[PDB]
From a paper:
The final model included residues 8–144 for chain A, residues 10–27 and 29–144 for chain B, two acetate molecules, six sulfate ions, two zinc ions and 201 water molecules in the asymmetric unit (ASU). The two molecules in th ASU are similar, with an overall Cα r.m.s.d. of 1.4 Å over 137 residues. The main differences are localized in the regions between helices H1 and H2, strands β3–β4 and strands β6–β7, which display different conformations. None of these regions are involved in crystal contacts, suggesting possible functional relevance of these conformationally flexible regions. Two N-terminal helices preceding the zinc-ribbon domain complete the structure and are involved in crystal-packing interactions. A search with PISA suggested that the likely quaternary structure of SSO2064 was either a tetramer or a dimer. However, analytical size-exclusion chromatography in combination with static light scattering strongly suggests that a monomer is likely to be the biologically relevant state of the molecule. Some of the most highly conserved residues among homologs (Pro58, Arg60, Ser82 and Thr87) line this groove, suggesting that it might serve as a binding site. We speculate that the N-terminal zinc ribbon contacts the nucleotide moiety of acyl-CoA in a manner similar to that seen in nucleic acid-binding zinc ribbons, while the hydrophobic surface of the OB fold (formed by strand β6 and loop β7–β9) could accommodate the acyl side chain. While several examples of OB-fold domains bind low-molecular-weight compounds, to our knowledge, this family appears to represent the first instance of an OB fold adapted to bind an acyl-CoA moiety.
Author numbering: 8 to 144
Amino acid sequence: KEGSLLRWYDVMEAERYEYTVGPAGEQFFNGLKQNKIIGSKCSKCGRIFVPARSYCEHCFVKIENYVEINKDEAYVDSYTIIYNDDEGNKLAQPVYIALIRFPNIEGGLLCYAEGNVKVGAKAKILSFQWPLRVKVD
Ligand SMILES: [Zn+2]
C-alpha cells in the first residue's frame, strides 16, 4: 500500500542506477557533486545528451566528449502534481514531478519541483543530489 511519493522515489532511484553505468554515468554523477549538469556530445551528429551517455544510438558510435550544460536555461517541459502525502495529508506546498529540459539538448532530468510551477517556466536547481530538486518562482 505504498503511495505516490514513494512510488515516484522508487522510479527515480531505479533510473539513477541505469544512468550510473559506464564512464559517462561517472562523469554525470561526479558533475552533480560539483553543482554541474554534465552532458555528452556525439561528434558525428552533434546531439548533446543529458544525462551524459557513452553511445549515440542515432549514429551507432561511441561518444567521448563531455560538455557542461547551462544550468540557468532549465525549463519545465511537463509535470504532474501530487496534492497529498502518502498518508492522505494535504500538502502546504504540493509536490510536482517534472521533466526538466534544456534548449537544444536531448533527454532531460526527472525532478522534484516546487513553487509556481507551469509548463515552460524557468526552473532553478536547488539540490544536485539525485533526484534533483528545482523551484519555479
Ligand atoms: Zn550521433
